[PDB]
Amino acid sequence: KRRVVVTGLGMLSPVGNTVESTWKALLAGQSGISLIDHFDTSAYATKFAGLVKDFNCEDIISRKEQRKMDAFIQYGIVAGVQAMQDSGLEITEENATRIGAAIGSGIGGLGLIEENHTSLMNGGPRKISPFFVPSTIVNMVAGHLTIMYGLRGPSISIATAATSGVHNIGHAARIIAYGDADVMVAGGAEKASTPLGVGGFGAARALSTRNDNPQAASRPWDKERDGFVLGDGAGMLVLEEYEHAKKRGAKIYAELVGFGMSSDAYHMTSPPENGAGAALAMANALRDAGIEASQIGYVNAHGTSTPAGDKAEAQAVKTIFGEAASRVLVSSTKSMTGHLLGAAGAVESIYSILALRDQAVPPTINLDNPDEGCDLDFVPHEARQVSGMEYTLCNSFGFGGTNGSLIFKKI
Amino acid sequence: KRRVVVTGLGMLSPVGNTVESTWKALLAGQSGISLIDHFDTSAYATKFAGLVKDFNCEDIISRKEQRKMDAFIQYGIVAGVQAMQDSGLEITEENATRIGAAIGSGIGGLGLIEENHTSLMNGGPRKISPFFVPSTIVNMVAGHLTIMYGLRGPSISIATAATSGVHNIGHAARIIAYGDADVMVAGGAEKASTPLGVGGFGAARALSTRNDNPQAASRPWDKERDGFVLGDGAGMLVLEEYEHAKKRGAKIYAELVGFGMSSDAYHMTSPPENGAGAALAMANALRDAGIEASQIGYVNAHGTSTPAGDKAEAQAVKTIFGEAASRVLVSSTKSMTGHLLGAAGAVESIYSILALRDQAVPPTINLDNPDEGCDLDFVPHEARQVSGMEYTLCNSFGFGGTNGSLIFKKI
Ligand SMILES: C[C@]12C[C@@]34C=CC(=O)[C@@](C)(CCC(=O)Nc5c(O)ccc(C(=O)O)c5O)[C@@H]3[C@H](C[C@@H]1C4)O2
Numbered sequence: 001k002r003r004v005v006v007t008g009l010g011m012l013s014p015v016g017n018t019v020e021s022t023w024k025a026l027l028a029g030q031s032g033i034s035l036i037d038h039f040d041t042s043a044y045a046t047k048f049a050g051l052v053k054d055f056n057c058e059d060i061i062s063r064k065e066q067r068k069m070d071a072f073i074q075y076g077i078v079a080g081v082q083a084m085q086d087s088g089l090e091i092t093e094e095n096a097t098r099i100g101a102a103i104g105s106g107i108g109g110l111g112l113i114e115e116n117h118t119s120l121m122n123g124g125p126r127k128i129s130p131f132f133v134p135s136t137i138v139n140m141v142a143g144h145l146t147i148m149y150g151l152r153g154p155s156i157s158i159a160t161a162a163t164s165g166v167h168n169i170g171h172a173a174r175i176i177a178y179g180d181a182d183v184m185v186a187g188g189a190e191k192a193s194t195p196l197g198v199g200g201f202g203a204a205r206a207l208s209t210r211n212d213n214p215q216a217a218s219r220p221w222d223k224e225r226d227g228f229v230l231g232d233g234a235g236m237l238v239l240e241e242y243e244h245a246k247k248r249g250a251k252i253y254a255e256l257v258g259f260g261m262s263s264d265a266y267h268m269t270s271p272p273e274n275g276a277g278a279a280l281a282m283a284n285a286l287r288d289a290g291i292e293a294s295q296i297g298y299v300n301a302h303g304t305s306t307p308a309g310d311k312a313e314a315q316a317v318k319t320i321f322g323e324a325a326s327r328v329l330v331s332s333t334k335s336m337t338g339h340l341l342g343a344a345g346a347v348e349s350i351y352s353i354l355a356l357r358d359q360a361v362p363p364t365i366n367l368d369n370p371d372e373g374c375d376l377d378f379v380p381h382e383a384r385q386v387s388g389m390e391y392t393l394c395n396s397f398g399f400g401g402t403n404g405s406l407i408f409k410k411i
Numbered sequence: 412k413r414r415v416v417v418t419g420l421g422m423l424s425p426v427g428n429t430v431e432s433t434w435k436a437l438l439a440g441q442s443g444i445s446l447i448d449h450f451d452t453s454a455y456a457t458k459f460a461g462l463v464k465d466f467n468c469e470d471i472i473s474r475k476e477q478r479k480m481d482a483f484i485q486y487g488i489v490a491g492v493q494a495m496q497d498s499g500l501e502i503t504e505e506n507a508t509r510i511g512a513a514i515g516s517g518i519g520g521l522g523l524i525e526e527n528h529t530s531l532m533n534g535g536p537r538k539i540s541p542f543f544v545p546s547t548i549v550n551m552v553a554g555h556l557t558i559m560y561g562l563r564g565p566s567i568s569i570a571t572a573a574t575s576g577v578h579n580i581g582h583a584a585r586i587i588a589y590g591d592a593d594v595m596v597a598g599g600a601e602k603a604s605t606p607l608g609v610g611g612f613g614a615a616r617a618l619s620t621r622n623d624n625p626q627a628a629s630r631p632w633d634k635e636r637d638g639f640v641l642g643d644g645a646g647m648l649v650l651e652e653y654e655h656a657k658k659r660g661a662k663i664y665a666e667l668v669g670f671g672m673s674s675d676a677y678h679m680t681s682p683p684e685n686g687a688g689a690a691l692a693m694a695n696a697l698r699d700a701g702i703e704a705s706q707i708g709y710v711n712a713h714g715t716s717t718p719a720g721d722k723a724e725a726q727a728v729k730t731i732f733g734e735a736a737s738r739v740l741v742s743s744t745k746s747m748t749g750h751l752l753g754a755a756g757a758v759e760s761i762y763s764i765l766a767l768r769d770q771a772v773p774p775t776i777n778l779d780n781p782d783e784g785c786d787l788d789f790v791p792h793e794a795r796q797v798s799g800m801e802y803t804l805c806n807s808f809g810f811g812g813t814n815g816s817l818i819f820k821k822i
């Protein structure tokens with residue numbers, strides 16, 4: 001009967017390049033959304049995104065080695081070290097075999113995909129870099145990190161669009177509990193603010209277009225939302241078995257108590273008005289954690305700020321809490337952070353964790369006027385202290401109707 | 412204490428468009444490798460691949476719906492139905508919630524990525540299809556299928572390069588055993604025979620170049636190998652809990668008894684001469700299944716026909732079997748099939764299953780002269796009947812040193 005605890009964090013976000021700086025900015029209702037400079041956004045309908053500011057990996061990645069990896073991989077490795085360091089774990093020949101990784105990404109190396117295709121179109125297969133495949137494939141963060149640290153235990157990479165982070169974190173926990181691993185670095189990495197990332201989700205009409213105020217673009221549940229905002233970043237947490245952590249007196253941020261998955265079985269890029277999918281996922285985590293919706297102090301919504309998106313998640317909240325629907329805090333970090341896709345669920349697992357450490361729940365900024373019949377506490381504009389909140393739940397939903405929820409318990 | 416059994420198969424391969432036709436061709440030492448016609452391979456160093464012959468989904472996918480999906484997705488859905496049908500399962504409002512999917516792919520919609528980028532480069536973000544994202548992202552087979560069948564249980568998509576199939580099948584089993592699901596469709600789909608797929612792996616010098624004899628190109632363990640051969644296809648199996656299958660008198664092909672994962676922690680696109688990684692993975696499945704290397708009648712090698720690739724897997728065999736190293740049958744379907752990447756481990760989980768049903772183990776064709784110090788039974792040129800083989804093991808290894816092995820038990 002093994003328990004999984006969190007003994008390390010690390011992250012890179014549009015509002016900070018450390019876990020602490022990122023948390024501080026989120027609690028301080030800071031936006032990270034900005035105008036895109038790295039490419040001509042003239043032809044683009046959306047000209048902004050939550051970018052990672054002044055990213056530097058020189059200390060961690062040999063620029064000779066950087067040539068072999070998309071930014072998403074770069075982002076992920078940097079956030080992985082952060083967490084490896086913050087864990088204090090020392091991998092030993094006796095260890096390696098029982099320390100693994102579960103780290104994916106929604107879209108992968110778009111950047112380098114684009115470079116290599118441009119290259120091919122211009123000068124043929126000759127120009128296609130020898131590093132094309134290993135520099136853009138989704139499981140590369142797992143591979144670089146496992147190597148860098150001599151990790152030899154289980155290594156997997158779940159690519160479930162926006163649900164990725166939650167899935168990897170959840171499946172890492174499962175791996176540990178099952179007995180396959182003792183420690184697992186898990187999370188996601190994404191850097192889809194590229195012509196194909198921006199143009200592509202804009203072609204789907206899924207992006208915000210509020211270019212006169214990029215800062216106000218992300219407004220989950222607000223009556224004025226017009227689609228999500230793109231965000232780059234990486235979120236990683238070190239998960240480990242209770243006794244293995246204790247026996248080494250690791251700093252322990254929390255306990256991963258429940259994990260729930262569901263499927264919408266409705267539409268490829270959209271949820272039932274019903275919110276049936278999200279409920280089942282929340283529903284299953286609760287049954288996994290073995291607690292009740294009443295005990296959930298804060299819900300880090302999937303809330304991407306898309307019209308149908310936000311409404312459906314709300315439906316699921318009511319449905320799941322019913323009574324305590326109005327008494328529960330629910331917010332979207334996406335109001336400041338943007339949508340980190342493959343990394344969203346990872347960075348939000350961290351927020352959901354830090355909210356328990358600090359007994360503070362970050363705001364859903366930009367929430368001027370809510371949707372009508374909403375009875376919920378969307379924790380609008382300004383952060384909000386909480387008292388005896390012992391469990392926080394994290395939601396992440398993805399294209400394909402693949403949903404997932406994680407439950408974190410204090411201590 | 413839940414057992415996972417296989418109650419459905421389906422697949423599309425360079426040697427067949429059904430499970431049975433594919434098996435027949437493999438046992439008959441048939442190659443599927445052919446010259447590529449769908450694009451100018453003049454500039455290309457490798458001009459052949461194992462392609463899916465005369466693929467037709469009209470019956471299953473509305474060509475209006477086909478516009479929204481890369482071939483890999485198409486391939487996967489077609490093989491998924493096959494398996495859904497062959498299971499005989501009837502999803503009911505009482506069911507849906509306990510039937511999920513675990514289906515990934517190594518590289519995803521390269522084809523459509525290429526089309527959309529070409530499009531953008533030629534006429535701007537305006538031409539980027541609204542279906543870019545949902546038509547190329549790796550978890551789309553999971554999403555279409557879950558919808559098509561009303562599946563609402565857990566849905567995940569492991570993208571671990573060549574290891575994908577084994578991971579999804581393994582994690583689907585885990586999901587079931589854990590109690591999260593009752594039935595799970597799992598496998599992988601890949602259609603990377605594209606300019607970027609061919610040019611890209613060729614840029615890495617990882618592909619064969621034997622264009623005068625595409626049929627002889629795939630030659631695992633042969634002294635003359637010069638890299639792997641690319642293959643398109645999809646492999647899907649319906650996994651389910653013993654009692655749930657029985658209670659419905661499902662046809663049961665086998666029992667999934669063990670699942671092992673490991674990490675090379677060595678090099679991004681290569682294994683230790685040592686084969687340390689593969690051993691650990693085989694090693695863990697054995698401990699998971701709770702049996703010994705002696706009991707493994709046949710090993711479906713990862714054996715991709717790359718110089719270092721094949722040698723390292725052999726090292727791991729000796730290391731793992733030691734004594735019974737010479738008494739165990741080990742082959743590579745890749746000698747006829749090619750490398751199906753994300754689908755390799757799925758289609759090979761099926762072979763490994765059919766080998767137990769038919770007590771026949773398919774050949775490693777093209778194995779004219781083996782590497783020297785090889786003591787192993789690579790099951791060269793011609794198939795080979797077996798007697799009381801009760802367990803077969805399936806190996807799949809991927810870029811990033813992510814390895815995995817599955818163990819199947821008769822009945
Ligand atoms: C075909 C349509 C219908 C349309 C209608 C109303 C909407 O509001 C949006 C903009 C998005 C619906 C939605 O929330 N999807 C959704 C989801 O199920 C899961 C995850 C995410 C995420 O961002 O991880 C997500 O975005 C949809 C998209 C675009 C186009 C317009 O599909």
Ligand SMILES: C[C@]12C[C@@]34C=CC(=O)[C@@](C)(CCC(=O)Nc5c(O)ccc(C(=O)O)c5O)[C@@H]3[C@H](C[C@@H]1C4)O2
Pocket residue numbers: 572573574615616617618638639679680681682715717718719720721750808809810811812
């Ligand atoms: C940097 C180098 C070194 C090089 C040297 C010798 C070789 O023989 C190859 C051709 C491949 C080694 C290998 O087997 N990799 C390998 C692997 O670890 C896992 C999976 C697969 C698979 O196909 O799923 C795979 O291919 C490598 C590749 C290309 C280049 C030449 O890396």
